[PDB]
Short mmCIF file of C-alpha atoms and ligand atoms in Angstrom, two decimals:
data_model
loop_
_atom_site.label_atom_id
_atom_site.label_comp_id
_atom_site.label_asym_id
_atom_site.label_seq_id
_atom_site.Cartn_x
_atom_site.Cartn_y
_atom_site.Cartn_z
CA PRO A 863 -28.48 -25.87 -1.59
CA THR A 864 -24.93 -25.71 -0.82
CA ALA A 865 -23.50 -22.94 -0.11
CA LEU A 866 -21.37 -22.73 -3.15
CA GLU A 867 -24.92 -22.84 -4.72
CA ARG A 868 -26.66 -19.91 -2.28
CA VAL A 869 -24.04 -18.01 -3.88
CA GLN A 870 -24.80 -18.51 -8.16
CA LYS A 871 -28.64 -18.67 -7.48
CA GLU A 872 -27.84 -14.97 -5.62
CA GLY A 873 -25.37 -14.17 -8.43
CA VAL A 874 -23.63 -11.76 -5.16
CA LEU A 875 -20.26 -13.51 -2.85
CA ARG A 876 -20.72 -11.22 -0.12
CA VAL A 877 -17.04 -10.85 1.92
CA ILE A 878 -17.03 -9.87 5.76
CA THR A 879 -14.02 -8.00 6.27
CA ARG A 880 -12.64 -5.19 8.50
CA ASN A 881 -11.78 -1.41 7.37
CA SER A 882 -8.33 -0.26 6.79
CA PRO A 883 -6.44 0.47 3.75
CA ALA A 884 -4.81 -3.13 4.25
CA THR A 885 -8.48 -4.66 3.83
CA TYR A 886 -10.51 -2.99 2.43
CA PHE A 887 -10.07 0.76 1.57
CA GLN A 888 -12.89 3.83 0.26
CA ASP A 889 -11.06 6.73 -2.28
CA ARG A 890 -13.25 8.94 -4.28
CA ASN A 891 -11.25 7.28 -6.94
CA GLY A 892 -12.19 4.02 -5.90
CA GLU A 893 -11.99 1.12 -3.09
CA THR A 894 -8.51 -0.54 -2.62
CA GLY A 895 -6.91 -3.12 -0.43
CA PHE A 896 -5.08 -7.29 -0.77
CA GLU A 897 -8.32 -8.98 0.69
CA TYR A 898 -10.60 -6.54 -1.25
CA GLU A 899 -8.87 -7.06 -4.62
CA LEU A 900 -8.12 -10.96 -3.82
CA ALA A 901 -11.60 -11.72 -3.08
CA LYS A 902 -12.64 -8.80 -5.92
CA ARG A 903 -11.16 -11.72 -8.15
CA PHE A 904 -12.18 -14.38 -6.80
CA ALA A 905 -15.56 -13.08 -7.42
CA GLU A 906 -15.39 -12.96 -10.71
CA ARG A 907 -13.28 -16.89 -11.02
CA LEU A 908 -17.51 -17.58 -9.85
CA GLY A 909 -18.63 -15.48 -12.44
CA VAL A 910 -20.22 -12.84 -9.57
CA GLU A 911 -20.54 -9.60 -8.12
CA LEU A 912 -18.88 -9.12 -5.04
CA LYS A 913 -20.62 -7.25 -2.62
CA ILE A 914 -18.56 -5.75 0.36
CA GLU A 915 -19.70 -5.98 4.28
CA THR A 916 -17.39 -4.57 6.94
CA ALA A 917 -17.25 -5.51 11.17
CA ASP A 918 -16.38 -2.45 13.74
CA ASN A 919 -14.24 -5.32 15.49
CA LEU A 920 -13.30 -9.00 15.39
CA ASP A 921 -15.67 -9.95 17.68
CA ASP A 922 -18.55 -8.50 15.57
CA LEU A 923 -16.88 -10.15 12.51
CA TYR A 924 -16.78 -14.01 13.50
CA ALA A 925 -20.44 -12.73 14.98
CA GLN A 926 -21.44 -12.30 11.71
CA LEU A 927 -20.10 -14.94 9.85
CA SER A 928 -21.97 -17.18 11.93
CA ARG A 929 -24.96 -15.61 11.85
CA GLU A 930 -28.44 -17.00 9.48
CA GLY A 931 -28.12 -14.53 6.20
CA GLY A 932 -24.87 -13.93 6.78
CA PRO A 933 -21.61 -13.25 4.78
CA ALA A 934 -20.02 -16.43 1.97
CA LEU A 935 -17.06 -15.52 3.56
CA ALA A 936 -14.12 -13.49 5.85
CA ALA A 937 -11.42 -11.92 4.01
CA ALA A 938 -8.86 -9.97 6.67
CA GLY A 939 -5.90 -10.88 6.98
CA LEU A 940 -6.81 -13.46 10.28
CA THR A 941 -4.50 -15.53 11.73
CA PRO A 942 -6.25 -19.46 11.65
CA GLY A 943 -7.11 -19.94 16.32
CA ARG A 944 -4.27 -21.58 18.48
CA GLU A 945 -7.06 -24.28 18.68
CA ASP A 946 -10.80 -25.90 16.50
CA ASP A 947 -13.47 -23.90 16.91
CA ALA A 948 -16.98 -25.71 15.29
CA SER A 949 -17.55 -21.60 14.23
CA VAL A 950 -15.22 -21.25 11.72
CA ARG A 951 -13.28 -23.36 9.59
CA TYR A 952 -10.44 -22.14 7.60
CA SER A 953 -8.91 -21.92 3.95
CA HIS A 954 -4.87 -22.60 3.43
CA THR A 955 -3.13 -19.71 4.36
CA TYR A 956 -1.77 -16.64 1.73
CA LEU A 957 0.29 -15.17 3.54
CA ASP A 958 3.26 -15.78 5.98
CA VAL A 959 3.70 -13.08 8.50
CA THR A 960 5.14 -12.68 11.59
CA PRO A 961 3.68 -11.25 15.02
CA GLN A 962 5.78 -8.22 16.18
CA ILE A 963 6.06 -6.58 19.16
CA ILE A 964 6.34 -2.55 18.56
CA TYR A 965 8.15 -0.16 21.11
CA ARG A 966 8.17 3.96 20.65
CA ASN A 967 11.99 5.14 19.90
CA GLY A 968 13.04 6.72 22.70
CA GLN A 969 12.24 4.20 25.78
CA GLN A 970 14.52 0.50 26.71
CA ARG A 971 13.34 -1.49 23.68
CA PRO A 972 11.90 -4.43 25.41
CA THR A 973 14.15 -8.23 24.35
CA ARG A 974 12.22 -11.13 24.89
CA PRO A 975 8.57 -12.29 26.31
CA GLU A 976 9.41 -11.61 29.62
CA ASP A 977 10.15 -8.00 29.51
CA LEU A 978 6.49 -7.49 28.53
CA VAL A 979 5.52 -7.38 32.46
CA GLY A 980 5.17 -4.17 33.54
CA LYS A 981 4.54 -2.27 30.17
CA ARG A 982 1.10 -0.02 29.19
CA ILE A 983 0.28 -2.90 26.46
CA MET A 984 -3.10 -2.24 24.18
CA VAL A 985 -4.21 -4.76 21.40
CA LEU A 986 -7.28 -5.49 19.35
CA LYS A 987 -10.19 -7.33 21.25
CA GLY A 988 -11.15 -10.94 20.04
CA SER A 989 -7.43 -11.37 18.07
CA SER A 990 -4.97 -13.46 17.96
CA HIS A 991 -2.48 -11.22 18.98
CA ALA A 992 -4.04 -11.07 22.66
CA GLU A 993 -4.30 -14.91 22.44
CA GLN A 994 -0.81 -14.61 22.84
CA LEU A 995 0.01 -12.56 25.30
CA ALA A 996 -3.36 -14.96 27.60
CA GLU A 997 -1.04 -17.62 26.98
CA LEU A 998 2.10 -15.63 28.13
CA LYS A 999 0.13 -14.71 31.29
CA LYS A 1000 -0.26 -18.05 32.33
CA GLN A 1001 3.75 -18.45 32.88
CA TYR A 1002 4.10 -14.42 34.03
CA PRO A 1003 0.73 -14.00 35.53
CA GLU A 1004 1.75 -9.92 36.42
CA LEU A 1005 1.30 -9.81 32.93
CA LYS A 1006 -1.14 -7.13 32.22
CA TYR A 1007 -2.47 -6.00 28.39
CA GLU A 1008 -5.94 -4.04 27.57
CA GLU A 1009 -7.91 -5.42 24.50
CA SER A 1010 -9.47 -2.84 23.12
CA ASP A 1011 -12.55 -3.30 20.62
CA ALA A 1012 -13.36 0.22 19.41
CA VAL A 1013 -9.59 0.79 17.70
CA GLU A 1014 -7.85 -0.73 15.08
CA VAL A 1015 -4.42 -1.21 13.46
CA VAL A 1016 -3.95 2.36 12.62
CA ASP A 1017 -4.48 3.76 16.04
CA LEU A 1018 -2.74 1.37 17.89
CA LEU A 1019 0.37 2.61 16.24
CA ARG A 1020 -0.40 5.89 16.93
CA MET A 1021 -0.84 5.50 20.16
CA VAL A 1022 2.77 4.00 20.68
CA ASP A 1023 3.49 6.83 18.32
CA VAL A 1024 3.06 9.28 20.71
CA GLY A 1025 3.49 7.57 23.86
CA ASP A 1026 -0.43 7.07 24.74
CA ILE A 1027 1.07 3.30 25.46
CA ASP A 1028 4.18 1.30 25.58
CA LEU A 1029 3.39 -1.34 23.85
CA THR A 1030 1.29 -3.16 21.21
CA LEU A 1031 1.38 -6.55 19.40
CA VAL A 1032 1.08 -6.45 14.99
CA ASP A 1033 1.33 -8.43 12.48
CA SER A 1034 4.43 -7.98 10.66
CA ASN A 1035 2.64 -6.61 7.15
CA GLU A 1036 0.35 -4.37 8.91
CA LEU A 1037 3.76 -2.80 10.46
CA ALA A 1038 4.94 -2.43 7.19
CA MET A 1039 2.20 -0.77 5.72
CA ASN A 1040 1.20 1.83 8.59
CA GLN A 1041 5.69 2.28 9.16
CA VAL A 1042 5.82 5.21 6.85
CA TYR A 1043 3.05 7.37 9.08
CA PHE A 1044 4.39 7.09 12.55
CA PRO A 1045 8.03 8.35 12.61
CA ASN A 1046 9.01 6.52 16.13
CA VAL A 1047 7.60 3.75 16.16
CA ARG A 1048 10.10 0.45 15.55
CA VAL A 1049 10.31 -3.77 16.06
CA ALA A 1050 11.06 -4.85 19.08
CA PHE A 1051 11.50 -8.15 18.69
CA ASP A 1052 9.22 -11.09 16.72
CA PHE A 1053 7.24 -12.93 19.01
CA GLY A 1054 6.29 -16.46 18.22
CA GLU A 1055 6.92 -18.34 14.96
CA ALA A 1056 5.79 -16.83 11.45
CA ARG A 1057 1.86 -17.49 11.03
CA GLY A 1058 0.15 -18.09 7.45
CA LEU A 1059 -3.36 -15.61 6.95
CA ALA A 1060 -6.37 -17.25 6.16
CA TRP A 1061 -10.39 -16.30 5.15
CA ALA A 1062 -12.83 -17.99 6.92
CA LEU A 1063 -16.00 -20.15 6.88
CA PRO A 1064 -19.28 -20.50 8.18
CA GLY A 1065 -18.64 -23.91 10.47
CA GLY A 1066 -20.27 -27.62 9.01
CA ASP A 1067 -19.42 -30.21 6.39
CA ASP A 1068 -19.70 -28.05 3.60
CA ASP A 1069 -17.15 -27.87 1.24
CA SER A 1070 -18.08 -26.45 -1.61
CA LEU A 1071 -17.31 -23.48 -1.41
CA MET A 1072 -14.59 -23.99 0.57
CA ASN A 1073 -12.83 -26.47 -2.34
CA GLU A 1074 -13.42 -23.01 -4.90
CA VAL A 1075 -11.66 -20.94 -2.81
CA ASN A 1076 -8.44 -22.86 -2.00
CA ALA A 1077 -8.40 -23.74 -5.91
CA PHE A 1078 -8.47 -20.25 -6.50
CA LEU A 1079 -5.80 -18.86 -3.88
CA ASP A 1080 -3.63 -21.97 -6.24
CA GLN A 1081 -4.08 -20.07 -8.95
CA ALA A 1082 -3.34 -16.76 -7.06
CA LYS A 1083 -0.27 -17.92 -5.96
CA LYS A 1084 0.97 -19.53 -9.75
CA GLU A 1085 0.31 -16.67 -11.54
CA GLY A 1086 1.86 -14.28 -9.16
CA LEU A 1087 -0.85 -12.31 -7.87
CA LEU A 1088 0.02 -13.00 -4.46
CA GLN A 1089 3.21 -11.51 -4.76
CA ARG A 1090 2.26 -7.89 -6.45
CA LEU A 1091 -0.61 -7.30 -3.84
CA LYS A 1092 1.80 -8.15 -1.27
CA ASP A 1093 4.14 -5.50 -3.14
CA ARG A 1094 1.64 -3.26 -3.06
CA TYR A 1095 0.35 -3.11 -0.02
CA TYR A 1096 2.91 -4.62 2.27
CA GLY A 1097 5.56 -3.53 0.28
CA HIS A 1098 6.67 -0.54 1.38
CA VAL A 1099 9.82 -1.72 4.21
CA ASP A 1100 11.07 -3.91 1.49
CA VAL A 1101 11.35 -1.23 -1.10
CA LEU A 1102 12.05 2.01 0.48
CA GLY A 1103 14.21 0.36 3.18
CA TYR A 1104 13.44 0.71 7.04
CA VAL A 1105 15.12 4.29 7.38
CA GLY A 1106 13.27 5.37 4.26
CA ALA A 1107 9.93 4.27 5.66
CA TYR A 1108 10.22 6.25 9.01
CA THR A 1109 11.81 9.17 7.17
CA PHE A 1110 9.22 9.46 5.55
CA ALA A 1111 6.75 9.59 8.30
CA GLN A 1112 8.76 12.20 10.04
CA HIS A 1113 8.41 14.26 6.96
CA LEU A 1114 4.81 12.75 6.35
CA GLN A 1115 4.33 14.90 9.57
CA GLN A 1116 6.85 18.15 9.38
CA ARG A 1117 7.66 18.55 6.31
CA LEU A 1118 3.95 18.30 4.11
CA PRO A 1119 2.32 20.49 6.06
CA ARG A 1120 4.41 23.36 4.68
CA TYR A 1121 3.10 22.75 1.55
CA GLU A 1122 -0.01 20.75 1.32
CA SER A 1123 -2.74 23.65 0.39
CA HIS A 1124 0.03 24.83 -2.44
CA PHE A 1125 -0.57 20.82 -4.48
CA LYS A 1126 -4.52 20.92 -2.73
CA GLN A 1127 -5.04 24.43 -5.04
CA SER A 1128 -3.01 23.36 -7.96
CA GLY A 1129 -4.95 19.82 -8.18
CA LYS A 1130 -8.15 21.48 -7.51
CA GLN A 1131 -7.72 24.52 -10.89
CA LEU A 1132 -5.95 21.04 -13.27
CA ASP A 1133 -8.73 18.88 -11.96
CA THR A 1134 -6.14 16.31 -10.97
CA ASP A 1135 -5.78 15.03 -7.81
CA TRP A 1136 -3.46 16.91 -5.22
CA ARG A 1137 -1.59 13.16 -3.21
CA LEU A 1138 -0.27 12.61 -7.02
CA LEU A 1139 1.39 15.58 -6.86
CA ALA A 1140 2.81 16.13 -3.79
CA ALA A 1141 4.23 11.95 -4.72
CA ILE A 1142 6.12 13.61 -7.15
CA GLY A 1143 6.89 16.78 -5.00
CA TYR A 1144 8.70 13.48 -2.85
CA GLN A 1145 10.03 11.78 -5.36
CA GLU A 1146 11.91 14.82 -6.79
CA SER A 1147 12.69 16.80 -3.75
CA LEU A 1148 11.56 15.43 -0.42
CA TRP A 1149 9.19 18.29 -0.04
CA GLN A 1150 12.15 20.72 0.02
CA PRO A 1151 12.24 24.64 -1.39
CA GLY A 1152 15.23 25.19 -1.51
CA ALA A 1153 16.96 22.01 -3.16
CA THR A 1154 19.67 22.13 -5.51
CA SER A 1155 21.55 19.91 -8.20
CA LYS A 1156 24.09 19.90 -10.62
CA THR A 1157 22.37 18.70 -13.26
CA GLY A 1158 20.32 21.52 -14.18
CA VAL A 1159 16.49 20.75 -11.89
CA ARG A 1160 15.64 23.03 -9.01
CA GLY A 1161 13.12 23.54 -6.60
CA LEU A 1162 10.53 21.05 -4.82
CA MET A 1163 9.72 19.59 -7.96
CA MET A 1164 12.78 19.75 -9.68
CA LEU A 1165 12.24 21.84 -12.85
CA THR A 1166 14.68 22.91 -16.02
CA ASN A 1167 14.25 26.04 -16.69
CA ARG A 1168 13.42 24.96 -19.96
CA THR A 1169 9.69 23.20 -18.04
CA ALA A 1170 10.14 26.35 -15.63
CA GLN A 1171 9.95 28.95 -18.57
CA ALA A 1172 7.16 27.19 -20.44
CA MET A 1173 4.61 26.40 -17.37
CA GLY A 1174 5.69 30.40 -16.43
CA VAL A 1175 7.55 29.55 -13.70
CA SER A 1176 9.52 32.77 -12.34
CA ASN A 1177 11.43 31.13 -9.29
CA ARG A 1178 12.05 27.57 -9.18
CA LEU A 1179 12.74 28.11 -5.41
CA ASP A 1180 9.17 29.08 -4.50
CA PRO A 1181 7.09 26.48 -3.88
CA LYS A 1182 3.75 27.42 -5.15
CA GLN A 1183 5.19 28.42 -8.41
CA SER A 1184 6.90 25.17 -8.54
CA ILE A 1185 4.58 22.89 -7.12
CA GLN A 1186 2.20 24.76 -9.55
CA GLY A 1187 4.87 24.78 -12.65
CA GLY A 1188 5.25 20.96 -11.89
CA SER A 1189 1.81 20.44 -12.00
CA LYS A 1190 1.21 21.82 -14.83
CA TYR A 1191 3.27 20.18 -16.78
CA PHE A 1192 2.79 16.53 -15.31
CA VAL A 1193 -1.48 18.18 -16.69
CA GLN A 1194 0.04 18.84 -20.07
CA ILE A 1195 2.62 15.92 -20.78
CA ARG A 1196 -0.12 13.66 -20.00
CA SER A 1197 -3.37 15.24 -22.33
CA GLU A 1198 -0.72 15.33 -24.57
CA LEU A 1199 0.31 10.99 -25.19
CA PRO A 1200 -1.09 9.71 -27.39
CA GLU A 1201 -4.88 8.47 -27.90
CA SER A 1202 -4.06 4.81 -27.57
CA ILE A 1203 -2.74 4.98 -23.74
CA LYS A 1204 -5.29 5.00 -21.70
CA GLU A 1205 -5.83 5.22 -18.25
CA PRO A 1206 -4.54 4.01 -15.16
CA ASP A 1207 -1.92 3.41 -17.54
CA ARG A 1208 -1.77 6.77 -18.90
CA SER A 1209 -0.82 8.00 -15.48
CA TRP A 1210 2.05 5.76 -15.59
CA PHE A 1211 3.19 6.37 -18.93
CA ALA A 1212 2.55 10.35 -18.05
CA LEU A 1213 5.08 10.11 -15.19
CA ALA A 1214 7.55 8.18 -17.20
CA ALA A 1215 7.59 11.63 -19.65
CA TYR A 1216 7.75 13.77 -16.85
CA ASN A 1217 11.06 12.65 -15.39
CA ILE A 1218 12.42 11.73 -19.25
CA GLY A 1219 10.53 13.80 -21.56
CA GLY A 1220 8.18 12.31 -24.59
CA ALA A 1221 10.65 11.58 -27.44
CA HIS A 1222 12.90 9.51 -25.28
CA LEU A 1223 9.45 7.32 -24.07
CA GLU A 1224 8.67 7.21 -27.39
CA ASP A 1225 11.50 5.74 -28.20
CA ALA A 1226 10.85 3.11 -25.52
CA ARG A 1227 6.93 2.38 -26.92
CA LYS A 1228 9.06 2.01 -30.61
CA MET A 1229 11.01 -0.80 -29.09
CA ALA A 1230 8.43 -2.42 -27.46
CA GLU A 1231 6.02 -3.05 -30.89
CA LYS A 1232 9.00 -4.25 -31.92
CA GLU A 1233 9.39 -6.62 -29.35
CA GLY A 1234 5.50 -8.05 -29.83
CA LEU A 1235 4.78 -5.83 -27.05
CA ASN A 1236 1.78 -3.83 -26.36
CA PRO A 1237 3.12 -0.13 -26.90
CA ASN A 1238 -0.12 1.22 -24.70
CA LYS A 1239 0.84 -1.11 -22.12
CA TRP A 1240 3.06 0.03 -18.93
CA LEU A 1241 4.04 -2.86 -17.22
CA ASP A 1242 5.67 -3.82 -21.12
CA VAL A 1243 6.65 -0.48 -22.08
CA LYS A 1244 8.65 -0.30 -18.55
CA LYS A 1245 10.77 -2.83 -19.56
CA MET A 1246 12.02 -1.41 -22.53
CA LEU A 1247 12.87 1.78 -20.68
CA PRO A 1248 16.25 0.49 -18.90
CA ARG A 1249 17.60 -0.33 -22.26
CA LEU A 1250 18.06 3.13 -23.88
CA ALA A 1251 21.14 3.49 -21.17
CA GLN A 1252 22.50 0.43 -23.27
CA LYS A 1253 23.93 1.46 -25.85
CA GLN A 1254 23.72 -1.38 -27.66
CA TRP A 1255 19.84 -0.21 -27.46
CA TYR A 1256 20.32 3.20 -28.03
CA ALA A 1257 22.50 3.70 -30.66
CA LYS A 1258 20.03 3.26 -33.08
CA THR A 1259 17.14 4.64 -31.88
CA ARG A 1260 16.41 8.08 -32.96
CA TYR A 1261 16.56 9.91 -29.67
CA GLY A 1262 19.18 7.78 -28.19
CA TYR A 1263 21.07 7.21 -24.60
CA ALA A 1264 18.67 8.23 -21.80
CA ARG A 1265 18.39 6.89 -18.34
CA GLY A 1266 15.37 5.20 -18.61
CA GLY A 1267 16.84 2.57 -15.12
CA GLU A 1268 16.51 5.81 -13.18
CA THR A 1269 13.04 6.05 -15.29
CA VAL A 1270 11.44 3.19 -13.83
CA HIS A 1271 12.96 3.53 -10.52
CA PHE A 1272 10.70 7.45 -10.80
CA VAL A 1273 7.66 5.70 -11.82
CA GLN A 1274 7.78 3.29 -8.90
CA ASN A 1275 8.05 5.71 -6.43
CA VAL A 1276 5.87 8.16 -6.83
CA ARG A 1277 3.26 5.35 -7.42
CA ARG A 1278 4.22 3.60 -4.81
CA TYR A 1279 4.32 7.65 -2.68
CA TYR A 1280 1.26 8.31 -3.95
CA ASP A 1281 -0.49 4.80 -2.63
CA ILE A 1282 0.45 6.24 0.72
CA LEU A 1283 -0.54 9.52 0.84
CA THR A 1284 -4.44 7.66 -0.56
CA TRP A 1285 -4.23 5.55 2.59
CA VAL A 1286 -3.75 8.29 5.44
CA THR A 1287 -6.45 8.34 8.13
CA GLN A 1288 -6.83 10.68 10.34
CA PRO A 1289 -6.68 10.31 14.30
CA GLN A 1290 -8.97 9.40 16.60
CL1 CL B 1319 5.51 1.14 -12.32
#
C-alpha cells in the first residue's frame, strides 16, 4: 500500500505546518494562510479532506514527519537543506525567497556578513537560517548567534523592533508580511542567493505522493494560484510600498488604539467584523478624525454631508460618530445589494458601492453582463469599473462618468488592510 494509497484509502490528507499567518492561521471567520490554501487545493485535487496539524518548531515538524503514523507532508515555507538527509525529501520549489538580515532603524546598518560579528542575534532553531550562520561562523569564529525553539518569525522581528536583540535573519516574503506590524524593522542586506521553498515528504523510495505533489504545483503555477496567494500573503510591500508598509505599522501602533473601541462597538452592534470597518477607516483617513478634503468629504470615515445626514451623524469630525455613521452606511449598502450577489463577493461589492455609490456600481454590473461576464462575480465586475472613467464607455450608461479606477484601488487596499488587521498576533 503506497503513501498515496494510504491517503486515498483514509480519505484524509494530513499536512503539518507552522502556526502563523504566513502558513496557517485560525480566526473566528475561518482558516487562512499561503500553505493552508495551497494544501487545501491539493487535497481537493486528490478528492480527500485536509487535516491540518501544527508543530511547535522546525525540529518538531521534521520529527513528526518522520515518525510512524506521521502526516503525509509538511507545508511550512521550508527551505531544502544545504545537503541531503535520508529522513526527508523535498518537492519541486514553488516560491523564490531571499534570506535577509533584519536590523533596527536607529542603530547602524550592518552591510556585509563580517559585520554580524559582535551583535546580539537570534534565529529560529533548526532553520536554514541558523545553518547559514553556522557556515558563516567557520569563516568568522567570533560570530555569536542564539537559536530559540520557543519563538516564531513574528517574535524575532518583534525583538528587533523593540531592541531586545540587534539582528535576526528571515526569508524576504515573511519580512514583507510582517513589516506592517513593526515600524522600526528594516532590511540590512540580502544574505545569500535566492532559494526555493518546497514541501517536505517522509524519506524512502515511495514516489506515489511526491509525483502528485509536483504535478499539482506545476498546475498551481499555470493557473496563477501561486502568484495570487503570493500577492495576498506576501505582497504587502509590493502593493503598499516600503514606506507605506512601515508607516502603516507606525499608525497601527500610535493611531488605532485611540479608535479601536469605537470600531469594536460599532462592529458589535452592527453584527459585522470590526477590522473590516477599521480597514475602511485607514483607507479613508489613515485613522485621522480631523481629516478633510476639497471634494466634500470629511472625518475619519470621510463622509459626505449627504451620507452623514442620512446616517444621523451630527458631527463628521467626531471619531465615534464618523466611525458609527460610515459603518452603518457600509452595512446598509451591503444589505441593499441585489440578492443574487453572494458572500464573499457581496462584501467586496459593498466596498465598491461605499466608495462609488450603488447607482454607478449597477452600471458596472450591466456592462459586465453585456460582455458576457458574471455580474455577481466581483473579479469580473472589477474589470468593468475603470470604464466608468472613460467617455467612450460612460456616455451611453444610465449614470455616466464615475472614478471607477479609484474604486478598484479602494477595494483592493481595504481588503489588504482587513487581512493585515485580521492577522495581528499578540506579544509573548
Ligand atoms: Cl479586490
